[PDB]
Amino acid sequence: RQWYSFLASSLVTFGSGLVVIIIYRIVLWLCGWMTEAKDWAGELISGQTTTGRILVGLVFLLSIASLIIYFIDASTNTSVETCLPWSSSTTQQVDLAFNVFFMIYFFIRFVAANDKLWFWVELFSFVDYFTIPPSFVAIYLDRNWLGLRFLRALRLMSIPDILTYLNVLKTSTLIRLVQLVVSFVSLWLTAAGFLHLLENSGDPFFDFGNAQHLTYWECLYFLMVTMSTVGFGDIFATTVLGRTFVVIFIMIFIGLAASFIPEIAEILGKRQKYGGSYKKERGKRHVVVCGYITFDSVSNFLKDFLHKDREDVDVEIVFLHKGLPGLELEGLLKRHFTQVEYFWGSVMDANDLERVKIQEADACLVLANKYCQDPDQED
Amino acid sequence: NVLKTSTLIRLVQLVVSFVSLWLTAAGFLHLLENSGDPFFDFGNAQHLTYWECLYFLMVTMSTVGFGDIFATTVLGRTFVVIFIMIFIGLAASFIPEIAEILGKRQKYGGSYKKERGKRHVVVCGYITFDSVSNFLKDFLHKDREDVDVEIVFLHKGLPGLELEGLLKRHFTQVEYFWGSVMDANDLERVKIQEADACLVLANKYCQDPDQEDAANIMRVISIKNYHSDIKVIVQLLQYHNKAYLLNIPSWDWKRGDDAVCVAELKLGFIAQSCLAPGFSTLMANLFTMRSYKPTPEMSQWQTDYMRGTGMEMYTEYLSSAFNALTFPEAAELCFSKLKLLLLAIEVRESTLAINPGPKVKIENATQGFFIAESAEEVKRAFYYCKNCHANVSDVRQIKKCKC
Ligand SMILES: [Ca+2]
Known part of the structure; x- marks a missing residue:
């Protein structure tokens, strides 16, 4: 019976x-409570000041x-x-204790976003419009409703x-990924809450x-098997x-097959395989x-440098090069891994010269591309 | 029409030819099953409803296939077998191509709004x-005066992720807009008439310096064509091109327009270093904002050098206490009492005098040029009230006197 009392409290807040x-706006069109407040709210919501920085991290944690x-x-x-x-x-x-703090942070924003129609319609304002009023109805009314409280997952x-x-x-690449991951965990959690509401x-x-009567966890599961287009129908x-x-959601999440899972796999695969440092034994x-x-x-180098007719010296060979080795070279390096190492880098960089412990190295050999396009550029 | x-006709053609066919096939499947x-x-x-057929066709078009x-x-x-063979074929274009077109919108459209x-x-x-x-780090530096200028970027491309991050960190006083100063509509978007100045930066590492200068001369032409009285400051990579600008019918050096020519300046500094070794590193440090930062792990000579790199050139009005002093005793007074080095003065028509001899005396509201650690330091030369107040050795004390 009474449920619409919660949702109406959200709508009258917005309206x-x-x-x-x-x-x-219409009265103006017929016709410190000054720009200092707009600037002061600005830095806060931006972490210019340390207090802004503390407040914004604490909004995130709450x-x-x-x-x-x-x-x-x-x-x-x-x-x-x-x-x-x-x-x-x-x-x-304790949820009401967090709820009042979001209401305080809202106004603050209102001030930075300068009391404006476009701000009053921005996504995070709706997250609040729909969370704050129902929790206040729950003070007046001895009842609880899950009532779009999942929308916090957008924050x-x-x-x-x-x-x-x-x-x-x-x-x-790190900002991009984290942006991809969090904007996938949000929306997934959010949609599970909305489907859970509509079915229950x-x-x-x-x-x-x-x-x-689904659980929220069954909605998370159901949305993952439809996002992946598996669709068991259990x-x-x-x-x-x-x-x-579900029909709307499929049309969205087939569209989000551009970027997301393939693009995060690309970025997470682009790491450097042959990073790290040599360790010199005495x-x-x-x-x-x-x-x-x-x-x-x-x-051609290894075959002569480690040849059986050569003296039984025990020198290790450390390659340093500005590229990923090919499969056949990784195979060759694997076969000789007892006395051969390879590192990504360039002798143009003093950090890479330290990685290979060049001061303790007995010698350094610089090989040339004898079949280059211009011998003078190779020299 | x-x-x-x-792109709009294409999309609308894609959307409507997807809503038709989907609705149509739902009707045909509804007929065949019922x-x-x-x-x-x-x-x-x-006995399906038409709505269950719409649902069923969406879960098969998407290849989800619950089978509920x-x-x-x-x-x-x-x-259904025929329809699958069609709608796997319509995976060419449709949903990916509409997402492409709908994503190609312009993120940084819109206009600046000028407060009074x-x-x-x-x-x-x-x-x-x-x-x-490099620009922001000097333009908004802590040692610089507490002026409240907003910076509006205008550029003909989407900013990279690290630049969007930098713009976000400074969003309280920095804006970015998609566009070009070649377009009079974009000059209005950024309210160029109300702008205090316009700065044109150059790609110093371009493939041809003469083409980069030609492009920047156009810009300057386009900005001045929109409104004559805008102060334009332009970076040029070759002196032989500076002339061109001099002809633009509204370049007025007296108004403020300027052209920092990286050739003229570079080679120049290097020349001065031939007459006085090391100068070029004196001056270059002098014209970049930098606070001093002592550390462990740094040699004695590096700390002395670093303290020196902290100082920059500033300019300020000399207080009334300097009136009728000769320049040498005014400079002595600045170094001894104020802890500031005074090089030069604006002499009233206007001219600039460097280290003028005893013949020249400080007139009222004379503007001086100083070397100091920051703008907060140079203000002592403005507040200094002579023997009426200023007789205590912690310079920090100097502050605006009663009379
Ligand atoms: Ca400084």
């Missing part, structure tokens, strides 16, 4: 503030704390709605902002009689709204070999 | 993470 913004309470709510009980006396459960109190997309404002993610509520067209949608949402000598390194040049 | 753009098969006197039949709904007439089935109190400068030409970071 009343929107109408206030419109009549304010967003996770509220999301975890939604997982505890979705894991426990059975129904999407129950008439719990408001004071009784500790989890419901987890602050991670790339937090890690770039605090500036720990240095590399372009049942359809309004059928007086909520047509309903299906779990499947049965409300008409649910179904719909007894062994070594020589560093660089310049033109290839399977034919290395095999 | 409402759909102007080639009629039943004619081979079996219509006894073999399955599935075809059971032999005609239905057939039609704030100044801004427009920056264009060679814009990249390294050039922008």
